[PDB]
Amino acid sequence: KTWVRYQETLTFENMAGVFMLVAGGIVAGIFLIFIEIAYK
Amino acid sequence: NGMIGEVVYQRAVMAVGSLTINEERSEVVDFSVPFVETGISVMVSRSNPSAFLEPFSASVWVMMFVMLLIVSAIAVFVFEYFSFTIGKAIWLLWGLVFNNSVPVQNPKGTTSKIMVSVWAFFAVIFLASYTANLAAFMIQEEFVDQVTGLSDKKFQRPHDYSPPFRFGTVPNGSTERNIRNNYPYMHQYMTRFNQRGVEDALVSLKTGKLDAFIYDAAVLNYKAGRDEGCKLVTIGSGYIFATTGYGIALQKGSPWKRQIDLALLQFVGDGEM
Amino acid sequence: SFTIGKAIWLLWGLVFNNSVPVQNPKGTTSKIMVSVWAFFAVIFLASYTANLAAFMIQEEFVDQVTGLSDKKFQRPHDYSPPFRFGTVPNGSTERNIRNNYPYMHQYMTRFNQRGVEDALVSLKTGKLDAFIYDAAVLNYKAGRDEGCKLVTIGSGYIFATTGYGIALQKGSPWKRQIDLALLQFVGDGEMEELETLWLTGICHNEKQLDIDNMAGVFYMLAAAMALSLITFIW
Amino acid sequence: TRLKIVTIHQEPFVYVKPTMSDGTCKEEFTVNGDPVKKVICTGPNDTSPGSPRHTVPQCCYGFCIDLLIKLARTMNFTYEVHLVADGKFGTQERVNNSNKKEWNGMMGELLSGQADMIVAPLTINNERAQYIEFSKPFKYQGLTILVKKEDSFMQPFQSTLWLLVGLSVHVVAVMLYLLDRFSPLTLSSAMWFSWGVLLNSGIGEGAPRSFSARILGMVWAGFAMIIVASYTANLAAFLVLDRPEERITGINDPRLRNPSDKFIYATVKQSSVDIYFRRQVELSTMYRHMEKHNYESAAEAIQAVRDNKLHAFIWDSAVLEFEA
Amino acid sequence: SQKCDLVTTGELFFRSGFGIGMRKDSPWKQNVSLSILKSHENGFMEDLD
Numbered sequence: 054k055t056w057v058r059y060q061e062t063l064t065f066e067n068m069a070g071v072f073m074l075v076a077g078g079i080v081a082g083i084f085l086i087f088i089e090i091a092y093k
Numbered sequence: 094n095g096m097i098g099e100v101v102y103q104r105a106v107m108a109v110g111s112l113t114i115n116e117e118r119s120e121v122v123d124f125s126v127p128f129v130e131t132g133i134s135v136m137v138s139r140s141n142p143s144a145f146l147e148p149f150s151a152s153v154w155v156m157m158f159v160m161l162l163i164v165s166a167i168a169v170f171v172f173e174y175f176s177f178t179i180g181k182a183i184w185l186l187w188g189l190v191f192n193n194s195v196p197v198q199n200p201k202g203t204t205s206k207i208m209v210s211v212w213a214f215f216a217v218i219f220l221a222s223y224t225a226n227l228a229a230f231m232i233q234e235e236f237v238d239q240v241t242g243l244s245d246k247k248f249q250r251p252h253d254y255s256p257p258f259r260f261g262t263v264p265n266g267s268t269e270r271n272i273r274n275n276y277p278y279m280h281q282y283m284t285r286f287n288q289r290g291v292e293d294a295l296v297s298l299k300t301g302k303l304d305a306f307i308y309d310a311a312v313l314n315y316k317a318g319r320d321e322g323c324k325l326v327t328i329g330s331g332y333i334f335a336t337t338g339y340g341i342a343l344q345k346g347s348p349w350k351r352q353i354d355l356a357l358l359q360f361v362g363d364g365e366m
Numbered sequence: 367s368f369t370i371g372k373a374i375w376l377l378w379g380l381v382f383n384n385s386v387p388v389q390n391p392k393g394t395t396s397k398i399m400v401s402v403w404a405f406f407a408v409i410f411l412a413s414y415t416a417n418l419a420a421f422m423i424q425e426e427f428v429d430q431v432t433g434l435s436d437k438k439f440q441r442p443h444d445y446s447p448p449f450r451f452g453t454v455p456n457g458s459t460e461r462n463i464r465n466n467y468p469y470m471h472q473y474m475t476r477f478n479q480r481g482v483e484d485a486l487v488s489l490k491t492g493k494l495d496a497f498i499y500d501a502a503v504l505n506y507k508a509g510r511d512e513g514c515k516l517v518t519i520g521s522g523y524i525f526a527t528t529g530y531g532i533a534l535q536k537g538s539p540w541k542r543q544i545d546l547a548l549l550q551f552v553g554d555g556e557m558e559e560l561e562t563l564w565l566t567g568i569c570h571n572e573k574q575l576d577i578d579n580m581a582g583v584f585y586m587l588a589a590a591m592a593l594s595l596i597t598f599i600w
Numbered sequence: 601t602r603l604k605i606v607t608i609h610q611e612p613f614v615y616v617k618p619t620m621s622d623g624t625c626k627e628e629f630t631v632n633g634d635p636v637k638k639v640i641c642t643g644p645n646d647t648s649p650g651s652p653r654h655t656v657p658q659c660c661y662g663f664c665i666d667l668l669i670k671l672a673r674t675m676n677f678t679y680e681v682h683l684v685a686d687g688k689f690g691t692q693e694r695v696n697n698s699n700k701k702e703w704n705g706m707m708g709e710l711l712s713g714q715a716d717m718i719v720a721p722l723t724i725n726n727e728r729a730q731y732i733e734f735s736k737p738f739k740y741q742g743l744t745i746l747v748k749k750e751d752s753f754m755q756p757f758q759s760t761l762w763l764l765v766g767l768s769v770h771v772v773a774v775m776l777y778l779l780d781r782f783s784p785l786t787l788s789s790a791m792w793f794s795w796g797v798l799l800n801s802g803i804g805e806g807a808p809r810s811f812s813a814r815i816l817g818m819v820w821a822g823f824a825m826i827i828v829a830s831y832t833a834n835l836a837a838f839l840v841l842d843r844p845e846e847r848i849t850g851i852n853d854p855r856l857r858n859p860s861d862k863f864i865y866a867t868v869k870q871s872s873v874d875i876y877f878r879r880q881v882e883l884s885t886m887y888r889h890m891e892k893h894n895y896e897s898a899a900e901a902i903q904a905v906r907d908n909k910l911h912a913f914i915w916d917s918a919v920l921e922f923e924a
Numbered sequence: 925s926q927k928c929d930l931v932t933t934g935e936l937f938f939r940s941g942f943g944i945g946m947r948k949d950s951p952w953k954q955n956v957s958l959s960i961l962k963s964h965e966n967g968f969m970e971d972l973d
């Protein structure tokens with residue numbers, strides 16, 4: 054109980070990092086689009 | 094019981110017939126050199142590109158529609174800041190995927206062309222993954238087996254999967270001791286699923302009264318070479334199995350046995366075996 | 367309407383179809399030729415991707431000689447460097463060659479050598495290319511080789527794979543007891559202990575991105591910059 | 601009266617930690633309300649090539665230390681835990697003089713009188729049972745093989761050619777804009793053309809003034825398409841030639857009878873499991889492969905198998921369950 | 925020389941003797957051997973090749 058019992062192209066796991074990086078790029082691109090519209 | 098009760102209790106001399114080797118039989122008697130290399134396997138019934146659900150599986154399709162709605166909202170915002178891309182932005186975003194659409198005049202606000210380039214790079218890497226999946230389709234050519242071996246997740250509990258199964262060995266033999274020297278839980282799931290006769294277990298596998306039977310691999314290959322119907326192809330050849338040999342067991346201290354080993358080492362190096 | 371002298375840019379842009387607009391084709395014959403050229407470009411791109419796939423399916427590295435019946439061993443005129451190989455004289459190796467290929471003995475007769483140490487010095491200094499010898503002794507020499515340089519072709523896979531024995535006279539009564547002693551020495555780990563002790567083990571067995579292809583494309587791109595500079599200065 | 605307890609650094613059993621200030625042990629708390637009752641042990645720092653001489657009092661705790669505390673709770677005695685110099689179990693090693701087979705490590709320190717009791721998961725075999733007496737076997741633990749069951753798009757892929765293509769299209773756009781300056785939203789139109797040639801999917805643009813720049817544009821178009829075609833082709837063919845076949849499944853595999861540089865398997869140097877594998881005469885080739893990569897400690901084996909330097913490792917089962 | 929889909933490999937192993945399978949003791953053990961020996965020295969395999 055002290056040590057032994059005490060534990061701690063599918064596009065779900067392979068492209069999950071693809072999904073996170075593409076989502077971050079989309080958020081950054083939308084932020085740059087709003088900065089470009091608010092500037093000019 | 095049997096030949097071990099005859100040799101250890103000094104009623105017989107040796108066992109020329111087949112006899113497995115484990116720890117306690119290495120303790121009570123002495124085995125010879127392995128004159129044969131055998132293995133075990135599991136015989137099952139194993140009786141006999143349509144549509145792909147690999148890239149999206151009706152879950153990422155919602156995210157495609159969300160990105161279409163976002164690009165349409167940004168196009169409406171640019172048109173408010175500033176030409177049919179108010180409600181028809183779905184056709185303009187998903188129409189530039191397959192690079193033969195009519196070129197629609199983009200606005201001069203440096204907004205549409207950047208996200209079209211980003212979606213085009215996403216389409217290039219998506220076509221790369223699509224051609225990669227179509228090329229990896231060449232790797233498989235037959236359906237995989239139901240039981241890959243002893244390392245299957247079905248042997249934990251068949252309630253985890255949808256079909257339940259069953260498996261048995263010989264009653265009170267060396268196979269049960271080889272199980273209990275490796276897995277007591279396998280003996281626990283096998284005790285309720287016992288059987289009586291090996292040929293009766295084969296008839297039960299044919300008629301569907303048994304799902305799996307553990308036996309020697311080479312003898313099952315010999316029986317599949319003479320099988321009526323030819324619907325038994327043995328899964329593996331000892332990869333996830335015991336794969337032990339057989340020797341000749343004499344009493345501890347027999348002087349003939351060494352000389353017998355000579356005959357064994359005469360029977361191998363001449364093609365006689 | 368600029369397809370008089372500027373047809374090279376239009377045609378080699380329609381080779382790749384990288385979304386390069388040129389003009390609005392009103393002639394039917396021009397659109398038919400562009401459609402046939404686009405179909406040819408699609409099947410050429412398919413053949414190019416199939417060529418790259420077939421090149422990647424080919425393995426990383428192969429040996430220089432991958433067989434006893436190699437075309438190098440028949441005649442070294444097949445390849446541009448004339449190689450060389452020698453065996454040990456006054457032994458059973460040359461007889462086993464002559465029991466299989468006396469022509470190999472004929473090619474070896476012009477490529478003779480003196481001794482094993484002399485052939486070793488010839489392999490170190492570069493006076494010998496290949497040397498036919500036993501399997502495990504060359505493995506012992508490779509395990510003590512400083513730098514893991516001299517490595518055999520594999521580990522003796524496509525060879526005869528013979529064994530060693532103890533020769534006695536025909537009719538020796540001690541032969542059965544010697545066979546008893548040897549088969550006792552094998553089946554107890556004693557021979558395994560001697561093969562662990564008296565064999566060295568320093569040199570072991572067999573100790574998306576590319577480098578040279580886009581470098582050559584960079585050389586052709588530097589030539590393209592040179593051609594663009596020539597067309598820019600005139 | 602004074603028992604010199606010797607042990608080996610086992611990772612789930614003997615946790616060794618340096619002291620806080622001077623010879624003290626931090627009374628840490630577990631999740632079940634049990635305070636960590638450490639003992640002040642005396643241990644070395646590294647191996648003989650590692651450290652010349654560095655032996656300090658540190659804190660030992662864990663499984664076997666609590667077992668020794670339970671033994672001292674049952675039977676009344678005094679003890680002091682000291683560590684072994686090396687990190688090996690002990691083999692029947694041939695010494696030079698007089699051709700004698702000797703034992704080292706914990707057995708070499710116990711039989712020489714330097715120790716009083718070995719506290720370790722001792723493997724019971726023929727050689728060690730005929731010399732000293734044993735106790736009741738408390739642990740029943742089998743062997744298993746630790747393996748690595750594990751699409752290089754941008755982030756798992758190395759960062760050379762991405763920044764190279766970015767700087768390349770930057771330099772191409774700058775020199776096309778400079779040629780648009782020196783003709784034989786202009787910059788925004790040049791960026792639109794440069795990112796539309798690379799777009800490769802369709803855009804509603806035109807054709808800039810390229811009387812001496814159409815060659816650079818067509819070569820850049822063919823250059824971008826041949827880069828993305830080679831990248832798509834070798835990623836696809838790489839993940840095709842990526843073999844899912846990785847499992848070994850025990851001692852029985854005909855592929856390991858003739859191994860290669862891919863099927864990597866080894867064990868801990870001078871371990872009793874290696875002695876048991878050397879004892880069986882049908883395990884000659886696998887022993888010759890495991891002796892190629894003999895590892896000193898288990899942490900080096902964990903670091904090698906985590907960094908994809910290994911493919912298979914022979915180790916006890918419950919310790920690897922704890923590591924899982 | 926008949927078709928164009930055949931490659932003969934360089935493996936020339938077990939260079940045996942293709943001759944005539946003969947009987948037991950017989951007076952045609954020597955005279956047939958002398959006729960074959962006369963066939964060796966002249967162009968008898970060469971013209972048949």
Ligand SMILES: *[C@@H]1O[C@H](CO)[C@@H](O[C@@H]2O[C@H](CO)[C@@H](O)[C@H](O)[C@H]2NC(C)=O)[C@H](O)[C@H]1NC(C)=O
Pocket residue numbers: 264265266
């Ligand atoms: C399992 O072992 C037991 C012995 O421990 C065997 O049980 C015997 O089975 C026969 C069947 O006719 C009975 O007549 C005996 O009375 C049983 N003996 C008992 C009660 O111990 C059994 O045969 C073994 N399994 C096998 C070999 O099939």
Ligand SMILES: *[C@@H]1O[C@H](CO)[C@@H](O[C@@H]2O[C@H](CO)[C@@H](O)[C@H](O)[C@H]2NC(C)=O)[C@H](O)[C@H]1NC(C)=O
Pocket residue numbers: 455456
């Ligand atoms: C290999 O054995 C042969 C004899 O079968 C040796 O060849 C000759 O041996 C005689 C007597 O020693 C010498 O006088 C000749 O000069 C030798 N001729 C040559 C050049 O071979 C030969 O010396 C032996 N040594 C080798 C090369 O292994």
Ligand SMILES: *[C@@H]1O[C@H](CO)[C@@H](O[C@@H]2O[C@H](CO)[C@@H](O)[C@H](O)[C@H]2NC(C)=O)[C@H](O)[C@H]1NC(C)=O
Pocket residue numbers: 674675676
């Ligand atoms: C703890 O130590 C004490 C001695 O201080 C032990 O008490 C004596 O043990 C001896 C052992 O032979 C007995 O003969 C005596 O009967 C004990 N003392 C008396 C006078 O009763 C005690 O046994 C030890 N406890 C343990 C668990 O070993």
Ligand SMILES: *[C@@H]1O[C@H](CO)[C@@H](O[C@@H]2O[C@H](CO)[C@@H](O)[C@H](O)[C@H]2NC(C)=O)[C@H](O)[C@H]1NC(C)=O
Pocket residue numbers: 696
């Ligand atoms: C044991 O003794 C030998 C000398 O008998 C020491 O030296 C080694 O000797 C062998 C040949 O018998 C050489 O192959 C080694 O290269 C020698 N070792 C050296 C100097 O690197 C050997 O060092 C001694 N080993 C022990 C355990 O002390």
Ligand SMILES: *[C@@H]1O[C@H](CO)[C@@H](O[C@@H]2O[C@H](CO)[C@@H](O)[C@H](O)[C@H]2NC(C)=O)[C@H](O)[C@H]1NC(C)=O
Pocket residue numbers: 954955
């Ligand atoms: C077969 O070989 C033998 C030995 O060379 C020869 O036999 C001669 O045969 C003729 C037949 O008339 C006899 O007259 C001679 O006397 C034989 N001579 C000898 C040497 O024995 C001859 O070459 C062949 N003929 C046969 C069939 O005997």
Ligand SMILES: *[C@@H]1O[C@H](CO)[C@@H](O)[C@H](O)[C@H]1NC(C)=O
Pocket residue numbers: 618645651652653654
């Ligand atoms: C010794 O141990 C300390 C930690 O207590 C460590 O920082 C150091 O690198 C080790 N080496 C030596 C001999 O100083």
